Amino acid sequence: FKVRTSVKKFCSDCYLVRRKGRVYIYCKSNKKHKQRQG
Amino acid sequence: SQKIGHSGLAFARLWHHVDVARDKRTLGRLASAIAITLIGRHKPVYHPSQDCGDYVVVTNCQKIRVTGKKFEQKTYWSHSGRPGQLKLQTMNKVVADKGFGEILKKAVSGMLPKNKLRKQRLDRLKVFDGSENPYKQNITAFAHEQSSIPEPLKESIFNQ
Amino acid sequence: SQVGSLPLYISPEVQVSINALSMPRIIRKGRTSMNISQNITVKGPKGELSVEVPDFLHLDKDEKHGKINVTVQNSEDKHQRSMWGTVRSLINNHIIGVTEGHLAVLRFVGTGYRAQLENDGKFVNVKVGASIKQGLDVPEGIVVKTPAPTSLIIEGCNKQQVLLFAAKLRKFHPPEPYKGKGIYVNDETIKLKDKK
Amino acid sequence: STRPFLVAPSIANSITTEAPAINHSPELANARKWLPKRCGLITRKKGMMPYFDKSTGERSAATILEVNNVEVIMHRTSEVNGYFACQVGYGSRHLSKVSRQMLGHFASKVVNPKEHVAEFRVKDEKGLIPPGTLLKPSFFKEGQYVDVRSVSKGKGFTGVMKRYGFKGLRASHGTSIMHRHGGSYGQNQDPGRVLPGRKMPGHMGNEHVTIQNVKVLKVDDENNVIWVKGSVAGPKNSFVKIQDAIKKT
Amino acid sequence: GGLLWKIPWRMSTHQKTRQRERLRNVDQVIKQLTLGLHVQRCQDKGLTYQEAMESKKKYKPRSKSLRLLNKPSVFPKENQMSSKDKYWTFDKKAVGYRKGIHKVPKWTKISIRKAPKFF
RNA sequence: AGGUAAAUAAUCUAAAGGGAAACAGCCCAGAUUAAGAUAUAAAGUUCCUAAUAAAUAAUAAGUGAAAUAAAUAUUAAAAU
RNA sequence: AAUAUUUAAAAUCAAAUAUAUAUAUAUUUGUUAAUAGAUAAUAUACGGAUCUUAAUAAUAAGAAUUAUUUA
RNA sequence: AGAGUAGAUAUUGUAAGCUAUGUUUGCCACCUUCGACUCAACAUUUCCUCUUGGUUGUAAAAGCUAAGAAGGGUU
RNA sequence: AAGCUAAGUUGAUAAUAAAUAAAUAUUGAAUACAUAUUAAAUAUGAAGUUGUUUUAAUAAGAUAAUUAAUCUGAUAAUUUU
Ligand SMILES: [Mg+2]
Ligand SMILES: [Mg+2]
Ligand SMILES: [Mg+2]
Ligand SMILES: [Mg+2]
Ligand SMILES: [Mg+2]
Ligand SMILES: [Mg+2]
Ligand SMILES: [Mg+2]
Ligand SMILES: [Mg+2]
Ligand SMILES: [Mg+2]
Ligand SMILES: [Mg+2]
Ligand SMILES: [Mg+2]
Ligand SMILES: [Mg+2]
Ligand SMILES: [Mg+2]
Ligand SMILES: [Mg+2]
Ligand SMILES: [Mg+2]
Ligand SMILES: [Mg+2]
Ligand SMILES: [Mg+2]
Ligand SMILES: [Mg+2]
Ligand SMILES: [Mg+2]
Ligand SMILES: [Mg+2]
Ligand SMILES: [Mg+2]
Ligand SMILES: [Mg+2]
Ligand SMILES: [Zn+2]
């Protein structure tokens, strides 16, 4: 997980999710693309 | 001239029921309503120098309305004086410990005026999570109201 | 909306009823609310199971062609519309389970990686590289069977419950990337890394 | 025939609902508690002496806890008292010493005027012993573990060196008039006050002390004593509770 | 800023209503001034007070300041004014180039209707 | 910079009273002595605390509720 | 539905006022929100309580927030 | 931007941009003692211990980096 | 010698349990896909939290006795646990 203020989806296989009052970006292909909005 | 007469009934401490299951007010609004009663602002004979407020029995307090996510967010604080002893409990935790009646009492305490009579006023509030309570028999009642109530229920209440 | 509008086909053996609950409960959001009153049931050959559902939703049972429909009192209400697509899908899943039955194959991959039915079906013992023994009890409704030691099958009427159980079983050892090695639920895949 | 009474509609027409159970109830607390499944007995710490294990040859210091007229006076129950416990009484006392009220209580419970009374809390109703019975050292098995409560030796008004193991100031190198003192007792203004529980000189000892998992070395009903491995809090002739160890089985 | 001038950045509802009322009062004052002048001029020409009040053609004020006040482009009425200009002054050093009117000193007396065209 | 230097206005200085939780300088308003019926100012009107009812929108974050924290990010919403 | 901007009453339209007046001219007004970003040391700190609504069911509650208003 | 055998975002992150802190060196002028010993209390921006995400740069083992975490400990 | 002591001796680092954090899932719409839910349902998850354990305080409750030839205390004496 890259925890950061900015949370953009990198590849096409990335998908944005809204859980626990935080924007997560998970990804099905590349595991490096996992991000979390703060 | 207006003051002269028998004042015993005016200064009589009545007992006021409130079935929280029936009442549609939220917690804080209910507490505010109670506070006035406890003070005795409702009655025209009131004076700031004299405690002349009524008893308030709250019942079925488990069914009290709380808006938003306050039941799992709202934190009740406490502190002895020794540092590193701040005790913060969420509303649900407080309920689990004591009850919804405790929560109501806290609200009512905060509503009340901060002086030597405050404690007395708080004491007069009698809260109950469920239905059954000892003060059942002493809530204000009238003979004209009796036709509304069925026959055996009254007897059962009296027995209780 | 697009999901909820799709009509559900029923075979004579299965019956989709609906009726009010004994003690309806109300889900209270911040602004909106949602009162769970009705209780749909899907009785069939393999078993029977139910869905507790809001008041605004209601079925529309047709005698001709075995179709039934589901509709809400206000489709323009967002929460209702969201519920509608869910409920229909749930009752379809139930129908599928009662008539055919839901299935979940777990294939174990690794040297000495295998499952075993320990308590006459009631406890799936799983051995997946651990000194301590691992496993968990099968829930009610779920029936487990092991064609091979390294290939377990979970079977049930509830699609939710079976696949949850499968996921739990997997969680002891999910597939590693370096060697495709672990517990694979149904058609599960993994991109194997280069060895180097 | 019937008495006059009015009843409010609001209290009569109120739908009946039971209150939810609260954590700060007695019954919840009882459920939570970590308790022994069996009663205990009061004893007196008579002294201390060596126990030689005859197989191995190992020596162990053992305290001799004497068991005299130990008797289940009465017991308490959840429905009446909020918890299960056995009120045990130890020893024999004169009439002269015992209060009239206490004598009457003992007569009611049908025991001799007792030297020391104490409760022994248990998990269940099964743990209660029938009242009036005599508890002997054979109650406990040899090799079993027991928890041991008693009031410690009184040490009097002690300093922070003896109380809290404070290092104190140096013996030489200029140190003036404060060799055994606690040094600083706070902080300049921020707090502006010595904060509660600041370790200071005060009275020490003469407080209760539970000692957990002590092994029952030896039991004999002939001399009326339980041998117990190691130390026990308090002076000689001090009363000592003994119950099964909750931690060790 | 150790001294605490605890003034809120925005106004309450009641404050806003009072401001509105004040604005309305100044417009009323202006109207009265123009009206009285008109009446006086009618009297000079030779009408009674009632006749002057009735008159279809109302006389506009000849003095400059009054005439400017009458113009809504220069001095707008409360009903004419924007929501923003009732409750927000122009302040070039503020972010947004805007500041609450309540932050102006003596705002209860001092009038300020017109802000710049795009600020 | 609660800094420094002057320009204009006000207050404090030398100004009590109401408001701004508490407050030299802010918002009102100038105590000759009382009285307390009527108009009120600024500020307020669930309770503490003197006094409230409505309308139409928006928020669900306790955001906020008298001391507004930025670039940027995400999710919506309108208009083209 | 998709792509890409803008978040605007300058223009434009709508509504209102004032001059000849069923029209013209001039003036005035009307164009997003939420969350994250967010953060230290005696103790929660809107001044405090507390405020976000709910049919069945009340001679009865339903912001006490923000914005535009009324009495 | 640029390093990272290839790929800016595993790890690294020039100069310029937007903030927080009041831990340093200053500035202001309302206001006229460093270290050691002793006992420490509090914070968390976590050094160790517990849980977890990422790591063509996680095979293993050692690491690196990030999220939760102040219970205990930290010559 | 007693006592007091640590260089000595003995014990404890307080479980089981409950709800959680980051994180990991199930079914599943809104949004024909997808999505662990900032939807309804359903699960995992920490030396942390609640507790548990220990000490001190308090005294709801409980047993008994109730104007006393020896009711309950105190003053007094001999003392130390
Ligand atoms: Mg020394
Ligand atoms: Mg000396
Ligand atoms: Mg000092
Ligand atoms: Mg002077
Ligand atoms: Mg003057
Ligand atoms: Mg003054
Ligand atoms: Mg004067
Ligand atoms: Mg707030
Ligand atoms: Mg603030
Ligand atoms: Mg224009
Ligand atoms: Mg704080
Ligand atoms: Mg306030
Ligand atoms: Mg390059
Ligand atoms: Mg740089
Ligand atoms: Mg941290
Ligand atoms: Mg490794
Ligand atoms: Mg703990
Ligand atoms: Mg040792
Ligand atoms: Mg432990
Ligand atoms: Mg789907
Ligand atoms: Mg999925
Ligand atoms: Mg744990
Ligand atoms: Zn991706």
mmCIF file of C-alpha atoms in Angstrom, chain B residues 15 17 55-59 123-128 131-140 157, chain D residues 11:
data_model
loop_
_atom_site.group_PDB
_atom_site.id
_atom_site.type_symbol
_atom_site.label_atom_id
_atom_site.label_comp_id
_atom_site.label_asym_id
_atom_site.label_seq_id
_atom_site.Cartn_x
_atom_site.Cartn_y
_atom_site.Cartn_z
ATOM 1 C CA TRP B 15 -44.453 12.998 39.856
ATOM 2 C CA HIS B 17 -44.040 9.936 33.999
ATOM 3 C CA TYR B 55 -40.131 14.472 40.161
ATOM 4 C CA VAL B 56 -39.646 12.970 36.706
ATOM 5 C CA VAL B 57 -39.821 9.193 36.286
ATOM 6 C CA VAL B 58 -38.428 8.118 32.910
ATOM 7 C CA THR B 59 -39.256 4.578 31.763
ATOM 8 C CA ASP B 123 -31.788 13.071 42.228
ATOM 9 C CA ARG B 124 -35.484 13.814 41.529
ATOM 10 C CA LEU B 125 -35.017 12.371 38.014
ATOM 11 C CA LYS B 126 -35.697 8.598 38.218
ATOM 12 C CA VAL B 127 -34.707 6.734 35.031
ATOM 13 C CA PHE B 128 -35.372 3.090 34.081
ATOM 14 C CA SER B 131 -40.776 -0.770 31.957
ATOM 15 C CA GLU B 132 -41.001 -2.028 35.552
ATOM 16 C CA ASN B 133 -40.203 0.463 38.326
ATOM 17 C CA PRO B 134 -41.153 1.161 41.983
ATOM 18 C CA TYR B 135 -42.660 4.634 41.370
ATOM 19 C CA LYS B 136 -45.420 3.191 39.117
ATOM 20 C CA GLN B 137 -47.868 3.743 41.998
ATOM 21 C CA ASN B 138 -47.106 7.482 42.566
ATOM 22 C CA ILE B 139 -47.407 9.134 39.132
ATOM 23 C CA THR B 140 -50.097 11.842 39.122
ATOM 24 C CA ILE B 157 -50.588 -2.328 38.877
ATOM 25 C CA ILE D 11 -48.143 3.959 33.328
#
